[PDB]
């Protein structure tokens, strides 16, 4: 299985100065909840951002740079590469790699920021037409999680 992992807002944005633009913690109680055990697939800008890989799972960066290498991290360095990972792999990011995977995932899994952002970086644009709503998901409005914001889980038509 092949998914997308991602929260963008509603215009698409995704990331502002390796950033979020915002603080949801239920959002990233989800994405440890949906891919513990399994792999995150990501471009080595997105990996940057985050810093160290994240524990309890597989982390794969693709890099063109063939000295790269970090402890926790397996190296892809072709798009190609992708396809021989056991499992369930997520496309974690960024903008670029979604360019790239979004007309080979089987599957999507969007948190929708229900606010506008300033960003510098956007999830491709995507219509329902070639994908269906397998759920829709409200989250929930707390002291700490202040965004209105829907998980759904879309899966190509
Ligand atoms: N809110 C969210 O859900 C998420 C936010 N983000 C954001 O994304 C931002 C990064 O922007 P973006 O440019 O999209 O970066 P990416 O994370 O997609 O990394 C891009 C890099 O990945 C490598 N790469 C991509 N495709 C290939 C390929 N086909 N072959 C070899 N290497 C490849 C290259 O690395 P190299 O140049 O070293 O060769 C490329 O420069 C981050 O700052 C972060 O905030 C990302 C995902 C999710
Ligand atoms: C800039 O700093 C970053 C930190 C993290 C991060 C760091 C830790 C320690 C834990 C977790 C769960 C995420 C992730 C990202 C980027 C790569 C992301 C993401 C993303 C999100 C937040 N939600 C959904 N649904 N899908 C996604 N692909 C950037």
Do not use: C
């Amino acid at each position: 299985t092949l998914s997308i992992l991602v929260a963008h807002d509603l215009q698409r944005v995704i990331g502002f100065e390796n950033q979020l633009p915002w603080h949801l913690p239920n959002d990233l109680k989800h994405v440890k909840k949906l891919s513990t055990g399994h792999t995150l697939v990501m471009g080595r800008k997105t990996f940057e951002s985050i810093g160290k890989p994240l524990p309890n799972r597989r982390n794969v960066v693709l890099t063109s740079d063939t000295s790269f290498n970090v402890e926790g991290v397996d190296v892809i360095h072709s798009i190609e590469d992708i396809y021989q990972l056991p499992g369930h792999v997520f496309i974690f990011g960024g903008q670029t790699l979604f360019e790239e995977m979004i007309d080979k995932v089987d599957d999507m899994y969007i948190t929708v920021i229900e606010g506008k952002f300033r960003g510098d970086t956007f999830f491709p644009p995507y219509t329902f037409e070639d994908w269906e709503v397998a759920s829709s998901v409200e989250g929930k409005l707390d002291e700490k999680n202040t965004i209105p914001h829907t998980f759904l889980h879309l899966i190509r038509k």
